[PDB]
Nucleic acid binder design. Structure first.
Length: 253
RNA sequence: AACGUACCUUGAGCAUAUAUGCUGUGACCCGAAAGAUGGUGAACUAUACUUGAUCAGGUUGAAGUCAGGGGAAACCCUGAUGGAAGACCGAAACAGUUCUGACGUGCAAAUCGAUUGUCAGAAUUGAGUAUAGGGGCGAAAGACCAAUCGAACCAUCUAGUAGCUGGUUCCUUCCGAAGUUUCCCUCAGGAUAGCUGGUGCAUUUUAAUAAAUAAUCUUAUCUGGUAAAGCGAAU
RNA sequence: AGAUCAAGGUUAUGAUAUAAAUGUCCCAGUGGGCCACUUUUGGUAAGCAGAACUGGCGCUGUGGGAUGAACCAAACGUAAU
RNA sequence: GGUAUGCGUAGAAGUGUUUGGCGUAAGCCUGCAUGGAGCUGCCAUUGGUACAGAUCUUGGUGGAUAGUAGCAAAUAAUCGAAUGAGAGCCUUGGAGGACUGAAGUGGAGAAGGGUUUCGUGUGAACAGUGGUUGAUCACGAGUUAGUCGGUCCUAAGUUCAAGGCGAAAGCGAAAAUUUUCAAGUAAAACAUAAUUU
RNA sequence: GGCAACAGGAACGACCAUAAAGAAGCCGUCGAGAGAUAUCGGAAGAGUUUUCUUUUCUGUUUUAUAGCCGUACUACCAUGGAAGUCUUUCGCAGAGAGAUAUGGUAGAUGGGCUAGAAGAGCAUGACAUAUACUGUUGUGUCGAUAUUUUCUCCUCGGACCUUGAAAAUUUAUGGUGGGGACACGCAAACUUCUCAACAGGCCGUACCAAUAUCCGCAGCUGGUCUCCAAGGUGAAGAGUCUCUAGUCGAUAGAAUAAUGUAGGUAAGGGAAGUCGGCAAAUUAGAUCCGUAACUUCGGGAUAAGGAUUGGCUCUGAAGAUUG
RNA sequence: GUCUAAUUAAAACAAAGCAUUGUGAUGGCCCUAGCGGGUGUUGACACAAUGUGAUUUCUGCCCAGUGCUCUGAAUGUCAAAGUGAAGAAAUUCAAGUAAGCGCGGGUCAACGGCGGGAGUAACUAUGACUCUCUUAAGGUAGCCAAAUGCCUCGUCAUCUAAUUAGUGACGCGCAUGAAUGGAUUAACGAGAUUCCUACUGUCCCUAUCUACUAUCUAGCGAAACCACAGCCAAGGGAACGGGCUUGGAAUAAUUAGCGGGGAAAGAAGACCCUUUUGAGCUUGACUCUAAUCUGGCAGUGUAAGGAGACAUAAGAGGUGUAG
RNA sequence: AAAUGGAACGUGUAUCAUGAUGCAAGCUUCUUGAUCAAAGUAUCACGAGUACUCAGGUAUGAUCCAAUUCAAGGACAUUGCCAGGUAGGGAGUUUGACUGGGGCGGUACAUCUCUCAAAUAAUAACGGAGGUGUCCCAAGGCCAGCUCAGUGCGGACAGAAACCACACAUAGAGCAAAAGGGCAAAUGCUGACUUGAUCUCGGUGUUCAGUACACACAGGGACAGCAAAAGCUCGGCCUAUCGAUCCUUUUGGUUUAAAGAGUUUUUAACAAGAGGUGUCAGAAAAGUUACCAUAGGGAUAACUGGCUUGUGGCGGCCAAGCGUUCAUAGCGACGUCGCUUUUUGAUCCUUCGAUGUCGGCUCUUCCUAUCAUUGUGAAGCAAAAUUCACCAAGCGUUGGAUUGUUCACCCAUGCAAGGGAACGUGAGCUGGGUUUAGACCGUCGUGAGACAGGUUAGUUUUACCCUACUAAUGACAAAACGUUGUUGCGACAGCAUUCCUGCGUAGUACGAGAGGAACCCGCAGGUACGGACCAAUGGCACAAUACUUGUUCGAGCGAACAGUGGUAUGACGCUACGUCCGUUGGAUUAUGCCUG
């Protein structure tokens, strides 16, 4: 027979969750209440708290409720320059200053942002990670449209009433310091996921991979897998338009 | 009137008892690698997680800092002070290399004794909890999953099948072979005729108180190109 | 060619018949063989293979070449000569 | 099932046998010696019917040896007194030699053991040698809590209300949808108020 | 009450509200302390004696919970206005966002005397009592010196794409209301004060805790979680050796054959031996130099290549308190 | 640093690094019998899937074959439903006709590839060259008898008293080579491959001594194994006896040793052919298979515009001799 | 699921000549506090108690108006079936056989001839030579005429050249194809004319079980075709030129069945063929396992023995010649014929319910086809040197560089280095290769994966049994006799010493000389083993004793303990590296001579 290939085991938890005991409380953007649609609000940052499992720094902040009596604590992603004791603002009437949070219809093109929301209400699921920057380069007053450039480079269209946090987001650049040994990039995957310190194909014994095994060690069967074969055959490099060296430019239009 | 018939041409079957086979299930006997449906265990071990815990003393001096000294500036220059790194030699912790040394019906279903490696981290680990049999897990050997691992482990459908091996039990009397042709995904087996044995049954002036046969020579009659020849015939 | 009368020696080569004559069970087995003489391919060849015609060995003891399944005598109820 | 007015505690079945005999042979008949309650012959039938064998199953038992193999790692035991039927021990207590060396062969804790801990008494197996003491038996006792601790809290995670699907069992399941699926709160009419997923 | 930091015997929570604690990983650290020990001296009694030794020994203790003194030690308060910069550690840390100072505040974990302390009890020995659950006498006195052969509070810094759990229970504060609340007093106070009665259920407890109680079919050199942890030499928790505790438990008295089992030396030459320099030998500690090529300029570095190293008798140096 | 736990610890693995590849959430990778889960307390400096391998230094040419996607211009294929025509009807064809494969490009840090022939230089030898053949393009920069050169004990110096080796260099290289990665590489190894330095019973060649055994004695006391079984030659045989025919021969019971013989015993051949035997495994092998892609109906709504005057209210055309 | 959307005032802007029109609009941003729990207002309760203690309500504060909780997607996802494609991810499978073992070749798997075949027939192997899966409307059917292979003489252009003529033409040709056979007014050339290459019924021939297919053959009946007739014709002149069910499918009577009865279409059936099974009596069918697990096999190999010897080591013979001459000193070509078993294949006879299979080490042994030593003889043998050849197994046949080796090839000793045996030998080792499990490389296969090609890494096991053998002791009995001495004899079996060296012999003999008798012998010595002893010397240690570290013994003796502390000397022994030793009789091969 054979096995589930090392692709296919990843959905059974017990050596494949994320080790999230020390992660720090489900960071999202603020919700749409009445006030951020109508006016604005003032909140205050009290400490900057680290997120083992990120690279990024968080942002701990609280607010006084327009409806209840208590304080209500939330967790942003860190805009750049965020000193503690900064006075944040969240509103359509809230004027642009880093790092406030304001909807797209009240800032022009040319600004950069972070923590972009696509669907107005779902509080910020776009382009927040370390060392990138949510951008908008297009306004359109016909049916309230604003095109944006994600850090992919592929520029796509979002609605305009959604919210985002103005400015670049803290953390970059943690690709340009080589981790340099097999003890730090143990701990780089101590608490992010549990991948392997990953093990190649061509010396898996060829019943428990596609590729490996043979008299030499060689991929042997060719290495461009289909559109949709039989999850999980797809170990390789899935549906590759190009392959190989790029002797040139690759940015999109 | 031609030809096929398992046909009638004055009927013979059934009812069981017996014996030998051929055939179908346990099919003479025990025997296999495996296929299945269900439950099963992480109490070594792969392995993350949780929470605990421990791992002696020693050499090498990293940035940072410290004045002395030179020079136009940039600042170069010994002296220290400082204790960082997956850094080194080493001990209980662990590992298991070469001796292919000590017992190889042990001390043992893997250990003892000399030797060797790491030893402040990819470290070492007690408990809790996940992961499941064609899958778990694997710093990848098809290792490991309870002395089992190229698929466990435990009861069944399971007396599962075998052209393949082992055994196939009392005495005398009578008779006494095969190893061949064909056919077959056969060439180690089966059917098939062959030989044999049994069962009587019909009958000879060749069977019952020859002028009729069937087998070896003769007599007669056809039948073949092998020796022996034959090149002063063919080929 | 057929039926039916007429004539017809002693039946027509030798030597026998331990008896001849047939229908079932398709009856249990067995479908691997071996050797010598001549006759004989394959090979230089062999205790090899490959055969036609017999006899034997397997089935078989036996007296004889000490010995030896086949060689040569003879094919094995119990007994004396 | 029929049968022989069948033998049988005045010895029936098998067991031995240097008593005697019949068959070609398998097998009986017979004498003696155990033995203690049931047995065979003719003729009809018949069942799981006679064994040298199956690397046969089970239970005794050989030679080698029934005394060979070997009980050789951890420095190494010793005279005298007891007592004892009897002592190289262990069983003591008297000396006094050397080990274990405080990352012990030392004192107490965990898992697992389950009566071993203790006195008293002892015969045989038990202690790969003995045995007067033993982790063996015999026979007795022996574990006390408000403070040590389980108990409460919650961790990774068991998926463990009925929204759901499956023929049902049940689900290698971040069950976040499930009138109120609120704990409620000394409370006020007129779902006690903003509150609790 | 205090200029304050905060102080005091107690003096307004019923809810709502923040804010902490409850809440730590791991590394090296100067400060103190605990006990473990070690030398010095009084004591008390034991050790040995040919010979000598004012000598080698045991033993001197005081628990929790309390009250009072109550500094190590960082951070605060008042003052004050520092450059000729200054203060401070093993470090770098510090300063007109107030440094040195002058005094104070609070944490004392720490100690030290007194409560605990019947010569408490205990212990070291005295004497006397057939002796017995007896009797009674005496002692408990001081300094010092060091250590991670260990724990502790405190202090700062260190690696780090490694940032180091939750929650039961809990304090104080904030808070609108509301309830106390007369001055000739009677008081009262879930009062967070003093103090008296009153119960606190459930079960687990003996022992081994591994060369004889576990699992290894067994009393089997085998794998088993941690805890205490001494004299000497010395780098040291090494390794050799004894005190302290405990063991002789591995079948025995005998006997000098091979071969084997392990620990060895062997005159010459020294790899020829054998698959091969593999078992095995030299080297090994520390100080003093002396260091080659190749380097990514961090090495190679203990390179190699050397010298030196007892015992005994001495001078020279490195400190603290009172100057 | 990691693994074969019980014969493989290394040249396999593991990195760090480097170029790629899908995904902007209706998502990609994926468990799923089905409902909902993992990735994800998340979001291109994150996730998923890879080939390699520090770095120092360069990534040689090729899109034919298959793998591969395509903003892909496509009559040549092409399934049901649905729509047409015949037919009394089951049925017969028609018009159709989407995705695939073919068809058109893009790509090798995707698998993998990367030739011979003659001639030719005032000696010879050569081949700077010249011609021709043919391919998707012709092994490029470097290396080498490499761990990879049949011929092999290559050809040449050196190490050596004398070296099939180890170093060097030489290239027609059976079958060297650029991330299936090429060529140099400084620091460490239970890594292999050789010559010195030290060296020693490794040996020339054995010499001896201590530790417990055997051995011998007192207790204790088994196991595999065994046709009965043991004196060899020659001959026969089933062909290298222990008995068989002739010989040689042959005097008990037994200890200490040793392994030449018992074709000694292990384990029902691990190699090997064989079963009309089965398990692993692979795609250019037979048939299917979950996932996936795709067309229709189903569930499934209300209006608009246009593309279809279809059925349909309603209008209008006629010239051959003659008349 | 908090403020959904319009409308109204609420201020400002612009235009309209104070309005309408549209808009901004209604409110917290300069600064780590913080706000909840109704005040205000209004009118009622407008009170109760009784000015007096104390009373609520609504709405405003805090705008109306309509409901869907909010966006975003919409008749598309999702989901139900069916519609085809991709789909080794995953499941079940098979992957023949024949064969001097297997592959890998091979068709010799059905099928045809010539032999192989021993004169009936029959018949063998992967024996020999081949052949076939076609081809032909004429190459068929049959009457008619007319005879070719060649070769002679010929004939403008005319040879190997054409075409006509004439003779000889026994078939030397033709006949579709291989090979045989037949074949002469045919079975050929040419010509005529036609479809018998037809329908039909059953038997018969060779394949053999006297089956089936197939192919031939003779009929009976028909319908014809040529020829005047008789006749000839049911395909190639005869030995090849080919197939069974299931169906698909025609052609068919103008045929029955559809089970209640019609009619009509469909299928269904019978009968002749064809589509098809070349592995030819008929499965639809690719790989490999160095991870592989089983039934077994000597019916079948690798290893060990065994007969055989193409191979090779191995001699004989006759002499063509060489050897200055001289064939035969030594040689011996061309050809002639013979033994061994070291290999090298052969073969498959034994062991597959296991014979531990390659080297070196240690170690006994035997063997002649003799290297050199003893005794000769030969020569182109002067001598020295060396060659030949007979007899001869007695001691001897080595120390090293690479390799894993036998050989190979070195270096050196040697006055000098020969071959061979039970594959001698793994319960004696070693494990370096080789022939498991790790792992890389080059190519070949698309790959898991092979590679008589290279790397490196890997458990090598039990004896106490019985003979065999070294050493150990020994009994009743037996016997020309006892229990027990001591002292003897040898039948008997083993048998071990060895070869060099120098000096003489002497520069002698000899030789022209050069060179040179290491001649006979005597003397001295030396190698290896062999047997022993220890005085001296080397080793090892009376672990007795002296210097000595660490710790306890209070201090002073010790060697107290560190499983032998380390060191140095060290007597008894035991030992080699040292020592002392190892020999004489009698037959008689090879041979010379003796006499005859």
């Amino acid at each position: 027979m054979g096995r589930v290939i090392r692709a296919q085991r990843k959905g059974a938890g017990s050596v494949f969750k994320a080790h999230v005991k020390k992660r720090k409380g489900a960071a999202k953007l603020r919700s749409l209440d009445f006030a951020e649609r109508s006016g604005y609000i003032r909140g205050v940052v009290k400490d900057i708290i680290h997120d083992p499992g990120r690279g990024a720094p968080l942002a701990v902040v609280h607010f006084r409720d327009p409806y209840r009596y208590k304080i209500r604590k939330e967790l942003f992603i860190a805009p750049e320059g965020m000193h503690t004791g900064q006075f944040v603002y969240c509103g359509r009437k809230a004027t642009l200053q880093i790092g406030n949070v304001m909807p797209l219809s009240q800032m022009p093109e040319g600004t950069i942002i972070c923590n972009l929301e696509e669907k107005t209400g779902d509080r910020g699921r776009l382009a927040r990670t370390s060392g990138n920057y949510a951008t908008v380069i297009a306004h359109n007053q016909d049916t309230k449209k604003t095109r944006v450039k994600l850090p992919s480079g592929a520029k796509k269209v979002v609605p305009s009433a959604n919210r985002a946090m103005v400015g670049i987001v803290a953390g970059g650049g943690r690709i340009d310091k080589p981790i340099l040994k097999a003890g730090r990039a143990y701990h780089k995957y101590k608490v992010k996921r549990n991948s392997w310190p990953k093990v190649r194909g061509v010396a898996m014994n060829p019943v428990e991979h596609p590729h490996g095994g043979g008299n030499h060690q060689h991929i042997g069967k060719a290495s461009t897998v289909k559109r949709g074969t039989s999850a999980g055959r797809k170990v390789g490099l899935i549906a590759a338009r190009r392959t190989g060296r790029i002797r040139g430019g690759k940015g999109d239009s």
